[PDB]
Amino acid sequence: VIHMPAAVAVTSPQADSAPAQRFSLPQGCHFRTFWRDEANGGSLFIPAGDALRCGEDGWLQGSGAVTLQQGGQTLSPTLWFLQGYPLAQVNGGDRALTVVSANAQRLILGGNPQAPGSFLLLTFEPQLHAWAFNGEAIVEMPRVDAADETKIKQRVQQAQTAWQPLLSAPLTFKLVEKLAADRVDPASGSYLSVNGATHLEGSEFKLV
């Protein structure tokens, strides 16, 4: 009853090679992101405050509310800066994560010591000029090990406790033999997906 999950071929094309644009702050540091001008006439506002500060690495650091304004609508996401990249919906300051890949389409978050071999996937949102996390995580596990059902449960449940303290949806894990860091979908070739739940408990009112 060895039920190895069936193999899936990696079919995603190579990811955009394009380098990000620099954004120079007065105190001399950069943050790096993507901004294709679709005649947006858009504005991006970094306020002054102790939330965000220039670090000695040459990059903007910290986590604060940025104000974006395009075509009437104003958005105020709080962004966290890692290696000069603005990230939404994830904040991992006291850990020391690594950006495995960053480009105009998506960014891969790695180097969580509490569960190596797992990765977060953030998709670029041009409306925010930032990468945002939406729940998608990759778990690197050999297909041989994925026959054992308690092994699957152990790996995905390790990654879930290793990442959730940094989160602000529940997680969805795609198991793959190897991260496809060079391709548009780094999950291309995933052989199984494990979805998690959010616990509800309270009182619903629904008017007749």
Pick between residue 27 and residue 94 the one whose CB is nearest to a copy of itself: 27
Pick between residue 91 and residue 160 the one whose CB is nearest to a copy of itself: 160
User: What CA–CA distance (Å, rounded) separates 184 from 37?
Assistant: 22
User: What CA–CA distance (Å, rounded) separates 64 from 80?
Assistant: 7
136 binds a copy of itself (CB under 8 A): yes
The SS3 of residue 110 is strand
Pick between residue 1 and residue 174 the one whose CB is nearest to a copy of itself: 174
User: What CA–CA distance (Å, rounded) separates 160 from 196?
Assistant: 9
50 binds a copy of itself (CB under 8 A): no
Which residue of 11, 13, 76, 93 would you call a contact of a copy of itself, by CB under 8 A?
76
Which residue of 12, 62, 63, 70 would you call a contact of a copy of itself, by CB under 8 A?
70
Contacting a copy of itself within 8-47 (CB under 8 A):
17, 19, 21-26, 28, 30, 35, 37, 40-47
Residue partners of 117: CB distance under 8 A and separation at least 6: 139, 140, 141
User: What Rg, from alpha-carbon coordinates, does the chain have?
Assistant: 19
User: What CA–CA distance (Å, rounded) separates 170 from 194?
Assistant: 11
User: What CA–CA distance (Å, rounded) separates 159 from 151?
Assistant: 12
Query: What does the DSSP 8-state code read for residue 158?
Result: H
Pick between residue 97 and residue 146 the one whose CB is nearest to a copy of itself: 146
Which residue of 114, 161, 170, 178 would you call a contact of a copy of itself, by CB under 8 A?
170
113 binds a copy of itself (CB under 8 A): no
199 binds a copy of itself (CB under 8 A): yes
In angstroms, what is the minimal distance from the CB of 46 to a copy of itself? 5
